[PDB]
Design a protein around this ligand. Structure first.
Ligand SMILES: *SCCNC(=O)CCNC(=O)[C@H](O)C(C)(C)COP(=O)(O)OP(=O)(O)OC[C@H]1O[C@@H](n2cnc3c(N)ncnc32)[C@H](O)[C@@H]1OP(=O)(O)O
Ligand SMILES: CC(C)(COP(=O)(O)OP(=O)(O)OC[C@H]1O[C@@H](n2cnc3c(N)ncnc32)[C@H](O)[C@@H]1OP(=O)(O)O)[C@@H](O)C(=O)NCCC(=O)NCCS
Ligand SMILES: [Cl-]
Ligand SMILES: [Cl-]
Ligand SMILES: [Cl-]
Ligand SMILES: [Cl-]
Lengths: 513, 504
């Protein structure tokens, strides 16, 4: 079946290489793409080759790359390999791009995901020269049907001088209808519109991205896969974390602080999130709802079982097996899933109104429960803040979950002071590790420390943490949030110097005595 | 005229001492009070005296005190003196209470102001035993007319098992009508209601707090004053800051990035705010609108002159001169001011919708533009985060303003690393000091550092900051946000050790 149903636009079809020539050195390029889903693939590959060829001749060729969130090897990977990106925002997971960022070869700012569209419209990234968007189909009236994510695509189409569409036949035609794109003012010039979502299953718009066809400079027919990461099977650490969390939810329900259907759930991807979703599938709940950034494998499983009634997201984040499952049953799943613009999925007004429960990962937390989501040792970017701030701050309950240690036990995920802060104490109420769960509601910082140290810290690090806290309480400049500035960041420096946060018995350490 | 207009409720009038006896050891007490305005006065004094007596007899007697925001000497002050508060939230400016907090004698958590009502309803502070609320009047239908703030009073009235009202004859009867109390679900059980505010001048509710009269256990007739703001004027540092900001607004308008009337303005309180508002009073931006937390002197002057058309807030914080001014022309000013529940004034959904410009003070920022609003050296509480996070993160533009130094030059307000973070880089776009203005929009952290160091840092500290940054770029673990962990907090330690951040 023909994917370009508007006949006039068929005249704009051309090869990926030709389309890539529209993108010039210095251009700001906005693309589709979120959690490895729905990013353009063939044009970036062609662009990267041409970039490398230019560089080899001493000719500069780089772009500014603004996305929904993370992309995949064909986009972030190829362009990073080519050293073709001078500025990148708002979120990346590609390892080559991460290296460019951490070497200072690519300038990076990880904006809150729900704010990116608004900042783009404000002009913070400059003038958009190109929007490069993957599509399932183009409708009779020239509507652009997105693929496996919506992201910021509508905003980029609005802002960009020229538009390139990749029509990807790998993407199931029955994605058409799964998206909800609003023409309302969510991220435009104030005063903005009320975004009138009052339930997670509510549609407010239509199935297509809208763009003036006169801005469409090229359409490329493609056939290539998303980046469907291998399923991260829960290990025992993940299962323990999920057990503590599920026990907590059960207790909240028994105390009438949550309904048996909980509240709309936001979760992440990977080991721990997978364990939580498996637990939710089998737990004493019913009629669950997702209002999140992503649809993951375990969410499909609950939609299938009926445990989850609907799932709202901006994107899919599926394994190859789950992608095949939904591909084979898209008629069923399309009725259970709504994919929204990320400025709507991550709208603080909506998140608060629905009372979402936010469940997010972390690099580390300090004893006072300030959270680092991004910068190892304070300086080395991992992925980016993503929507963790959108959700943590706006949520009814903000929960952070992590193994109590990292790097095979050589790093403590609970530290005297976080080396970088993404989520302040006020934005984190519950911490869960494989050691236990800290409920910090209504606690002062010193009370938070008592709970975090006792419930969440690993036995290998708890005495060290207690020692820091005890001496800080005796010596700190103020006693409201006790610190010893002489050693607050010393465990991080110890890791940098020695490869472990565990102290040597060849020197004096206060907790050894 | 009679302030208790409901005849039946007059039978509940009793002394402050007797009313204080309703409050028991361990109780959670929610009170009126925000920016030194509208907090209960006489019952807390009577309670404090009884607490001291009890402690002397060997009886425990402490409460959890949850407010709108800051109160005054009769409440935070007297209770702190009596060692009568085991937990305090969300915002304090009293020196005695600050000392209890910094000694570890009172537990404190400074929640985001717009979230306090919702957390109270969720149960985070425990069951509310008592709501203690100051009133201008009680209407014939039993409505409680708030005084100089709204704060969290409606939520506390809803939650509390027993209610005590202080009817304060010191408060101007013409305050009646200025408040806008919404009937809907802003901070209750999800799913919450949409608040239909789409303009800052929009009233969506009524003039009174509502409470079941059967929950009123005591009414106390009082006569005592709120706290006033200082009359003190903007010095040259503050005026320079205001000048840079006003020039920036002018350029934004010229580039069509702001309307000629700007956008709804949120302003913190202090010297810098006064200068900014004083600057705006004679500025080129007409038909201004305030959507803020507090009505300060500067706003009154603008409402007076007509440069500002309307101002929304939850509270007043006025100098005695400005208080005299408004109390003489209340009918005029009442038509230009709307006092809202703080969960509405500080609602991120509303703030973002309106596109507020947030202007807030700070203790310090680091070279990457993370901001500390609260904890000196990382550990010693000043006031609290207040609504600075509510507004900074939700705003159309988030602006932080500070002198480039503190303590007579012995502290740099720009440091290698903030000793505590309240506002992450993403939540701060513009920094202004008396040295200049740093526009950080669209910049990576290393690009932010170049702007902050070169535009905002004091000349005494700029080379030291540049030296730190340059060596960090060479030697840092990663180069995305370069740091030297061995010296990141060393300027703070240097201040602790020597009394100055400047080396010998
Ligand atoms: S309604 C939404 C906004 N709410 C808030 O922003 C709440 C938190 N903000 C505040 O409490 C103030 O804005 C702070 C950050 C304290 C700044 O207040 P000012 O604008 O009035 O600035 P001042 O220069 O007058 O400083 C006031 C006191 O703070 C001390 N101080 C400032 N900076 C430092 C540093 N870097 N180090 C140590 N102390 C610092 C000043 O000394 C001053 O203290 P005093 O003892 O009262 O003189
Ligand atoms: C913080 C975050 C990196 C944790 O990832 P995770 O998958 O949950 O858990 P992991 O334990 O596998 O950690 C991932 C990486 O961070 C590293 N890491 C985690 N904690 C660390 C620590 N305390 N110190 C050093 N490295 C750490 C791990 O080693 C791992 O690195 P690797 O890929 O080289 O092996 C991740 O949640 C994230 O990027 N968050 C930001 C975006 C976000 O939260 N969006 C919200 C909605 S999903
Ligand atoms: Cl809204
Ligand atoms: Cl809390
Ligand atoms: Cl709303
Ligand atoms: Cl930005």
């Amino acid at each position: 079946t023909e994917r370009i149903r508007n006949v006039a636009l068929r005249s704009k079809v051309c090869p990926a290489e030709t389309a890539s020539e529209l993108i010039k050195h210095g251009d700001v390029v906005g693309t589709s793409g979120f959690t490895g889903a729905g990013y353009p693939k063939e044009v970036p590959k062609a662009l990267a080759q041409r970039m490398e060829a230019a560089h080899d001749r001493g000719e500069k060729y780089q772009i500014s790359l603004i996305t929904g969130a993370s992309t995949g090897p064909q986009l972030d990977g190829e362009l990073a390999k080519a050293n073709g990106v001078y500025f990148r925002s708002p979120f990346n997971t590609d390892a080559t791009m991460r290296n460019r960022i951490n070497a200072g070869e690519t300038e990076y700012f990880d904006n809150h995901l729900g704010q990116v569209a608004g900042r783009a419209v404000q002009g913070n990234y400059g003038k958009f020269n190109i929007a490069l968007v993957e599509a399932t189909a183009i409708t009779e009236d020239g509507g652009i049907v997105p693929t496996s994510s919506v992201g910021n695509s509508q905003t980029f189409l609005n802002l960009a001088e020229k538009v390139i569409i990749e029509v990807n036949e790998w993407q199931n035609p029955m994605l058409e209808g799964i998206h909800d794109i609003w023409d309302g003012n969510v991220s435009g010039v104030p005063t903005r519109d009320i975004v009138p979502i009052v339930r997670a299953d509510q549609r407010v718009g239509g199935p297509v991205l809208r763009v003036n066809p006169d801005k469409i400079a090229a359409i490329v027919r493609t056939n290539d896969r998303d980046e469907n990461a291998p399923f991260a099977a829960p290990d025992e650490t993940a299962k323990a974390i999920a057990g503590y969390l599920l026990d907590f939810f059960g207790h909240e329900v028994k105390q009438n602080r949550l309904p048996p259907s909980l509240l709309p759930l936001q979760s992440g991807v990977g080991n721990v999130a997978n364990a939580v979703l498996e637990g939710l599938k089998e737990g004493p709940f019913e009629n669950l709802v997702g209002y999140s950034e992503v649809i993951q494998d375990g969410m499909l499983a609950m939609l299938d079982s009926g445990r989850m009634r609907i799932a709202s997201a901006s994107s899919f984040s599926l394994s190859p097996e789950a992608a095949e499952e939904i591909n084979n049953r898209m008629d069923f799943f399309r009725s259970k899933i709504i994919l929204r613009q990320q400025d709507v999925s991550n709208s603080p007004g909506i998140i608060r109104r629905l009372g979402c429960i936010a469940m997010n990962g972390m690099i580390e937390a300090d004893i006072y429960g300030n959270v680092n989501s991004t910068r190892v040792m304070g300086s080395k970017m991992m992925n980016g803040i993503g929507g963790s701030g959108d959700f943590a701050r706006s949520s009814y309950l903000s929960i952070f979950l992590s193994p109590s240690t990292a790097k095979g036990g050589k790093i403590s995920a609970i530290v005297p002071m976080a080396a970088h802060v993404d989520h302040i104490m006020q934005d984190a109420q519950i911490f869960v590790t494989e050691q236990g769960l800290a409920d910090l509601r209504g606690l002062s910082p010193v009370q938070r420390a008592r709970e975090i140290i006792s419930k969440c810290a690993h036995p290998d690090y708890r005495p060290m943490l207690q020692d820091y806290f005890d001496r800080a309480l005796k010596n700190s400049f103020g006693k409201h949030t006790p610190h010893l500035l002489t050693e607050a960041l010393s465990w991080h420096q110890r890791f940098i110097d020695t490869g472990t946060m565990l102290p040597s018995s060849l020197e004096h350490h206060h907790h050894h005595h």
